[PDB]
Amino acid sequence: EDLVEKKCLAKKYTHLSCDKVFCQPWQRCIEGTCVCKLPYQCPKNGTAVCATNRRSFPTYCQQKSLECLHPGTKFLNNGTCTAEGKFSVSLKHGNTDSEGIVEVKLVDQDKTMFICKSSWSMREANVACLDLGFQQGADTQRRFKLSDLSINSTECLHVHCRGLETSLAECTFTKRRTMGYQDFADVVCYTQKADSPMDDFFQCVNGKYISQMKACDGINDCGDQSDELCCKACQGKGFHCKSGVCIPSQYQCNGEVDCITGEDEVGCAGEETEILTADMDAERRRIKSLLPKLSCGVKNR
Amino acid sequence: IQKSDDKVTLEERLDKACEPGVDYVYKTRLVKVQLSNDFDEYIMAIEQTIKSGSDEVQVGQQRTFISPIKCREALKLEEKKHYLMWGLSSDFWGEKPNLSYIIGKDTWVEHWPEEDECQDEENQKQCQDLGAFTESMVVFGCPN
Amino acid sequence: IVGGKRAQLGDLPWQVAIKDASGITCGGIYIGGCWILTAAHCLRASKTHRYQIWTTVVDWIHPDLKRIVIEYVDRIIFHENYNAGTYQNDIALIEMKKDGNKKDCELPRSIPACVPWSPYLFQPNDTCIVSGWGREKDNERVFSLQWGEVKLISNCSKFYGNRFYEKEMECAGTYDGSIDACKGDSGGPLVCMDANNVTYVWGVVSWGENCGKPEFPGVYTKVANYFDWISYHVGRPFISQ
Amino acid sequence: DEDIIAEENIVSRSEFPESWLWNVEDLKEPPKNGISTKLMNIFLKD
Amino acid sequence: EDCNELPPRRNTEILTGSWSDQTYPEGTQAIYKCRPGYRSLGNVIMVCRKGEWVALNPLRKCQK
Ligand SMILES: *[C@@H]1O[C@H](CO)[C@@H](O)[C@H](O)[C@H]1NC(C)=O
Ligand SMILES: *[C@@H]1O[C@H](CO)[C@@H](O)[C@H](O)[C@H]1NC(C)=O
Ligand SMILES: *[C@@H]1O[C@H](CO)[C@@H](O)[C@H](O)[C@H]1NC(C)=O
Ligand SMILES: *[C@@H]1O[C@H](CO)[C@@H](O)[C@H](O)[C@H]1NC(C)=O
Ligand SMILES: *[C@@H]1O[C@H](CO)[C@@H](O)[C@H](O)[C@H]1NC(C)=O
Ligand SMILES: *[C@@H]1O[C@H](CO)[C@@H](O)[C@H](O)[C@H]1NC(C)=O
Ligand SMILES: [Ca+2]
Ligand SMILES: [Ca+2]
């Protein structure tokens, strides 16, 4: 069955292409490509944030916009900056430098903790490898299984991202208990060296190779929405837009227009976990709510 | 405006370049100067967009700033140099295929020292004022 | 417009008529503020002061004298790379003049129409509505406003050949249906509704070929290709990017 | 409880007219041996 | 059929829990709710008993 389109592949659409998906609040659309907007053009109704250069920005949007203009200035901590505060992510007990076990040293706490395997997915995988030096996100076909590793502690951090973030400091972090701690977060960052096909190439725009079944399933396996902006029908439980983009299942009736057409949020008639540097992903949807609203195509007066 | 060789502080630059007349504020670099009998053209590449207006930028692309030949002598614009330029929206001229900029009566044109030159002590004052200016305009802007 | 029903006040608010000294020629669509989207070939007259713009036109050679508000024409804008032979880039903008007391155009009746940003917004087999001041059969019936439903058809190069261009044009026609906008309803709106019933301007009546039933569907210049052209002139407008 | 319709999902019968179907129909169908048959859909009362 | 994803989003039902994870072990039942405008005899229950998602109540559905 022909799930991938041929004419769309010539353009190699990314998350910056307006012709498939909305831009981010810190971006506008110009000639079908999301281009970074100036920091003073962001809405001014938000909270202060801290970057990697220990510089304070009035709102979240301006930090991402300046990061957009000058790359490298990632995110650090919610609120004002801290002198000794630093966010670090490392890989321990790895046979090489491109695999191992996920460890996170938060800006708040000095203690370096591990991640559950239940909360790990492709959304948080590619964002993890990004600030680690792997420009092509994480690998989908290769998984790192332990050498029968003995784990002492039981503390875990439950992680949730969107998929297009630039560092794991942006995503929400919650601490959870795990009896015995059989959960175990692994990661295999993608290893580059260019190749030849066979092997169901399904080439990404960034150049990463994944399996057939991984594309057009609602999952952003490439890291820049390359296997999702070129679909005629979705593989798994992903929903299909009129344009030709596959979105995750929980993106329906979630309070945010995902498709450019907007058919995912029609006919929609449808929590003890705690704190740790507050979720910025929700602030992204809040800023979108403060975008230029006005009437067009309204039935009523 | 020739507003230089006077008290050209930081408040002055913020106050002048924030007027409603001023539409765009760009930092440009003079690539080539084609001298002519009719007009003068300064093909400049907009290195950084401090404030954007009608023309939507790519960084790397170039735009030609046209000026009457009588003005060539008042500010000898040399190639491979940088400048802080801001102007009105009324200084636009062309449909879009040949869209040029006019250094008019309200066009601010200040010389921008090179990075090795800012280490020098003669350009020290101007370098500090200009760097701050760009930062304040991008993040904070004009109060409106 | 041929087969269709009489428009009445509430239906199709985005419809705008343009009337010259000699009757009514074509008609555009209101997209908010003081801007109108029409065809370039119809208004290529540069006699801007004599041109008139009518809204909530209802039924002609009577009207409702109450909310039959008309506005003057201030400025014309034609597409530069417009070709007269192949009818490419057949798009134009109209700026309406308003008195100095109230800035911008305050039109409380007709409702603006959003503008598409991507060619992937609408696909063939979609229920679209073409409405204007056109000719059923061949009758000079440019007296009553008619509207009817049409569907977009894909790959129009089979029926017109060298004259059609898929990057800059789009075809709308009904299979086995003879309902086809033709002649008198030029520059009119090709409006299609989404799942939210948001009203978009997919195209405006560019050219065609002597009506002709479901054999040769009407050709409309596609708006989504000229999104940057309209956005450049109106200053990043109503619709969310 | 289990295996029973909730109270709010039960629509009580309320239409108890002593007489209804006070309608008018015209036989415009193509005759068959002079007889024109007209199929009429009606909604019964409660 | 491999409990490493969320339950099958039904056509005329809706979920009831938080479901803030992705992989679920040991008979993790999924109680579906009848969408507004639909009636049923009770909560349709789906179960993940290792190997596959299954339906605990086949003969129970949400009618209009
Ligand atoms: C942000 O929200 C509204 C405008 O959206 C503003 O009035 C309010 O003061 C702001 N919030 C806070 C906590 O100041
Ligand atoms: C952290 O950010 C969130 C979202 O922007 C905000 O609600 C919260 O008040 C912030 N916390 C502090 C201490 O500023
Ligand atoms: C894990 O470490 C803690 C702290 O050192 C210790 O109390 C506990 O006994 C350890 N558990 C095992 C199984 O070694
Ligand atoms: C949809 O298009 C197909 C051909 O692409 C056609 O066979 C079918 O009849 C169309 N359906 C509708 C409802 O227009
Ligand atoms: C599409 O149009 C071309 C004409 O350029 C025609 O040759 C071709 O057969 C059409 N496609 C199909 C599937 O018929
Ligand atoms: C507009 O909403 C109504 C529901 O009241 C219905 O016609 C349909 O869902 C929408 N129309 C279109 C064309 O999608
Ligand atoms: Ca995928
Ligand atoms: Ca959604």
Count of beta carbons in the 10 Å neighbourhood of residue D35: 8
Closest CA to C153 of C86, C220, C104, C74: C220
Please give the domain boundaries of chain B with CATH numbers for all domains. 1-144 (2.40.50.120)
Report the C-alpha gap between A26 and A49 in whole angstroms. Answer: 14
B95 touches chain C (CB under 8 A): yes
Q: What is the DSSP letter of A8?
A: G
Disruptive mutation site among D7, D9, D10 for chain E (greatest number of E CBs within 10 Å): D9
Chain A residues with CB inside 8 Å of C200's CB?
297
E42, E24, E22: which is closest to E32 by C-alpha?
E42
Closest Cα in chain E, distance from residue D8 (Å) = 10
Distance CA A280, CA A283 (A): 5
Q: Is C41 in the active site? A: yes
Measured in whole angstroms, the distance separating CA B140 from the mean position of its chain's CA atoms is 19
Helix or strand run (H / E) with residue E52: strand E52-55
Q: What resolution (Å)? A: 4.2
CA distance A35 to A17: 10
CB A102 within 8 A of CB A115: yes
CA-to-CA dists, residue C51 to C44, C79, C100, angstroms = 11, 19, 20
Q: How far apart are CA E2 and CA E8, in angstroms?
A: 12
Q: Measure CA of the first residue to CA of the last residue in chain E; give whole Å.
A: 29
Protein residue with its CA nearest to atom 3 in ligand 5: C158
Token code pair at residue A7? 């004419």
Interface present between B and C (3 or more CB pairs within 8 Å): yes
Separation of CA B6 from chain center:
19
User: Would you state the structure tokens that stand for residue C149, as one six-digit string?
Assistant: 């439903």
A 10 A CB-CB count for B91 gives: 20
> What is d(CA C189, CA C200) in angstroms, rounded to the nearest whole number?
9
Question: Which H, E and C letters describe chain C, residue by residue?
Answer: CCCCEECCCCCCCCEEEEECCCCEEECCEECCCCEEEECCCCCCCCCCCCCEEEECCCECCCCCCCCCCEEEEEEEEECCCCCCCCCCCCCEEEEEECCCCCCCCCCCCCCCCECCCCCCCCCCCCEEEEEECCCCCCCCCCCECEEEEEEEECCCHHHHHHHCCCCCEEEECCCCCCCCCCCCCCCCEEEEECCCCCEEEEEEECCCCCCCHHHCCEEEEECHHHHHHHHHHHCCCCCCC
Task: Give the Cβ contact number of residue A288 at 10 Å.
Answer: 16
Whether residue B56 and residue A62 make contact (CB cut-off 8 A), yes or no, is: no
CB A122 within 8 A of CB E22: no
User: Residue B90 phi/psi, 5° resolution?
Assistant: -75, 0
Task: Give the separation between CA A38 and CA A30, rounded to whole angstroms.
Answer: 14
Among A42, A47, A64, A275, residue to substitute to test ligand 2 (most atoms within 8 Å of Cβ): A47
Q: What is the Cα Rg of chain D in Å?
A: 20
Place of tokens 């909305």: A22
Query: Alpha-carbon distance E60 to E48, whole Å?
Result: 18
**C72 min Cα distance to partner chain B (Å):** 24
Q: Which residue of B has its CA nearest to C233?
A: B54
| Domains delineated in chain D | 1-46 (2.20.130.20)
Number of Cβ within 10 Å of residue A231's Cβ equals: 25
Residues making up chain B, counted from first to last: 144
The single-letter DSSP state of residue B11 is H
Q: Yes or no: say if B36 and B43 are a contact pair by the CB < 8 Å rule.
A: no
Q: How near does any CA of chain B get to the CA of C233, in Å?
A: 9
CA distance E64 to E62: 7
Pairing of strands B22-35, A239-240: unpaired
**Is B96 an interface residue toward C (CB < 8 Å)?**
yes
Please tell me what DSSP assigns to residue B80. T
**Chain E residue at shortest CA distance from A119:** E21
Of the candidates A125, A105, A121, A124, the one whose C-alpha atom is nearest the C-alpha of residue A113 is A105
3-class state of residue D41 by DSSP = coil
Checking DSSP bridges between strand C35-38 and strand C52-55, what pairing results, if any? unpaired
C33 CB-side CA count, 13 A: 16
Q: Does residue C125 line the site of ligand 4, with CB under 6 A?
A: yes
Reference C67, options C145, C13, C114; nearest CA is: C13
Residue identifier of the C-alpha nearest atom 5 of ligand 6: C197
Q: Quote the crossing angle between the two packed helices A281-289 and A60-69, to the nearest 10°.
A: 100
- For residue C90, indicate whether it is catalytic: yes
Q: Which of A30, A17, A31 is nearest to A243 (CA)?
A: A17
